[PDB]
């Protein structure tokens with residue numbers, strides 16, 4: 001064991017038996033194993049890690065080390081030969097709104113986050129990766145192949161730093177490297193409220209005992225709130241327009257400002273917390289701030305759970321939904337509610353659903369201004385377009401009226417993500433999320449595509465024609481075998497996303513299984529699930545079900561025309577109704593009288 005820099009948590013905390021609310025960290029959810037699902041613990045390993053050295057090192061690291069007898073291809077080569085495409089025409093999903101993509105990023109962010117170590121690294125090590133493309137320690141650069149346009153204009157590589165892990169702790173037993181999940185595994189609004197005490201406290205409005213989340217003091221949205229700005233230099237949201245000097249938002253999850261629709265969604269969630277606190281106070285003016293914060297949080301946590309499991313999962317999983325996520329039976333305390341490492345790659349299917357543009361739409365759902373449509377890449381780390389240029393209402397309208405990209409075997413990831421991605425700590429709109437996804441797959445020691453096929457009770461192709469029949473695509477299978485030379489060596493991100501979609505869904509069979517299990521586990525294994533007997537009252541539960549994204553939008557913006565089913569492709573004015581024709585969240589059953 002080399003003296004490599006690493007972060008390892010202790011990390012223990014004590015538990016309260018009677019507590020009616022979740023902890024911030026997610027500790028104490030499970031009584032028998034209180035750290036299960038808590039943040040800052042290892043991602044769970046559904047199958048043993050697969051490293052080149054049966055050790056931390058990742059496949060692709062040493063030149064002369066093969067995987068199953070073949071060299072693994074460069075992540076950027078796979079990306080260029082398989083993931084990329086020119087023509088954006090015909091790629092939109094005729095029956096998914098762009099809100100469908102956006103919820104998935106939201107749900108992803110609630111559940112997992114494996115930050116790189118590099119933030120905790122010496123400046124000489126950061127600059128050595130970028131400036132010289134030299135592989136060492138964490139630094140694991142994505143090298144360009146020879147016929148790559150980025151060679152000519154960017155250098156010999158893209159920088160990349162290995163994910164954080166729980167660092168060797170005694171007895172230096174032979175355990176493979178285990179990456180950290182930095183947020184709570186429970187679907188618990190941790191992206192709004194935080195997964196650590198210190199952040200969760202900074203986000204709160206202490207000053208007024210009304211249980212409010214802190215809001216921006218420097219700017220407002222026709223009176224409605226924005227999240228506070230976050231103080232830290234450098235701020236990537238500053239770097240992208242140094243004239244506008246509008247920093248990133250400060251939210252319960254670090255990645256909130258990564259793109260403008262995510263920030264929009266986080267802004268909707270904040271507002272609902274505050275709206276709930278106010279109305280609860282009215283009902284219960286005797287409740288103090290803590291009680292009002294906790295009861296609102298709890299309501300918002302259920303809201304995310306209902307929207308995800310009632311509205312989102314059925315239309316991702318389609319015909320496999322019932323098989324993996326059958327109706328609820330109550331809290332089972334022997335279920336592992338931890339997020340698996342493989343899930344953090346499975347759920348990147350979202351990436352194939354991101355389209356190349358974003359639109360702002362007026363109150364007649366017509367283009368908001370002369371440059372109302374914008375290219376996705378101009379919107380990475382871009383808070384100024386919100387603050388300065390119309391607020392969230394136009395952006396929300398385009399989440400409703402515009403469409404997600406459909407996954408498609410010869411048009412996988414838009415070039416806005418595949419060539420023009422911006423990352424903090426690098427200066428250029430020049431990165432490739434697909435390449436990064438593959439490198440990270442390796443970084444995490446992921447078993448290859450057949451291991452997971454076999455895990456999920458599915459066949460394991462060994463030849464070209466085997467592969468063709470599974471992918472139902474001769475040319476893609478050809479390109480894959482040319483790169484891999486086998487299917488055992490195909491990285492799970494690209495293998496799982498290549499399979500045609502299941503009926504009524506938007507992922508294939510392998511991903512539906514992987515995702516399927518995970519979500520079933522995080523519902524069944526959660527002591528605070530909204531429907532779990534005892535968490536809410538009977539009467540509370542009849543109000544809670546009524547929720548809808550539509551209602552969330554009406555309540556927290558000045559939009560009055562929304563569809564009933566928001567994840568559907570909805571075209572206005574046909575599929576749009578007056579806000580009034582939509583159910584509310586009835587808060588009466590929260591009035592807790594003396595008697």
Ligand code: HEM
Pocket residue numbers: 101102103104105108112113114115258259343344345346347348349350351353354417433436437440
């Ligand atoms: C413009 C929209 C989006 C962009 C630019 C984006 C970009 C990124 C980037 C750069 C990462 C970190 C990659 C790494 O360091 O390994 C990431 C993480 C991730 N993204 Fe996205 N993403 C977007 C939306 C989505 C959507 C819609 C989904 C799925 C619905 C999704 C799923 C994920 C997952 C699962 C992770 C891994 C989180 C983890 O670290 O555990 N993302 N995204």
Ligand SMILES: *[C@@H]1O[C@H](CO)[C@@H](O)[C@H](O)[C@H]1NC(C)=O
Pocket residue numbers: 095315568
């Ligand atoms: C659109 O999708 C929903 C599932 O989200 C489905 O119920 C409906 O039939 C779909 N419409 C069409 C035309 O496929």
Ligand SMILES: *[C@@H]1O[C@H](CO)[C@@H](O)[C@H](O)[C@H]1NC(C)=O
Pocket residue numbers: 205207208210212213214215216217
């Ligand atoms: C805290 O709430 C009070 C109203 O109760 C408000 O005037 C103040 O702006 C809030 N502070 C922050 C930082 O949101």
Ligand SMILES: *[C@@H]1O[C@H](CO)[C@@H](O)[C@H](O)[C@H]1NC(C)=O
Pocket residue numbers: 240241243244384388
């Ligand atoms: C920067 O923001 C200002 C407004 O604050 C705007 O007029 C300008 O076009 C923006 N520039 C870029 C390069 O995005």
Ligand SMILES: *[C@@H]1O[C@H](CO)[C@@H](O)[C@H](O)[C@H]1NC(C)=O
Pocket residue numbers: 329332333334335
């Ligand atoms: C609880 O989960 C475990 C997982 O192995 C399973 O064996 C058992 O069927 C579950 N119990 C109930 C009552 O659902």
Ligand SMILES: NC[C@H](O)c1ccc(O)cc1
Pocket residue numbers: 254255256258422423424
């Ligand atoms: N927070 C900055 C970083 O580039 C990032 C941004 C967005 C993500 O979804 C994941 C990671």
Ligand SMILES: [Ca+2]
Pocket residue numbers: 110111183184185186187188189190191
């Ligand atoms: Ca969570």
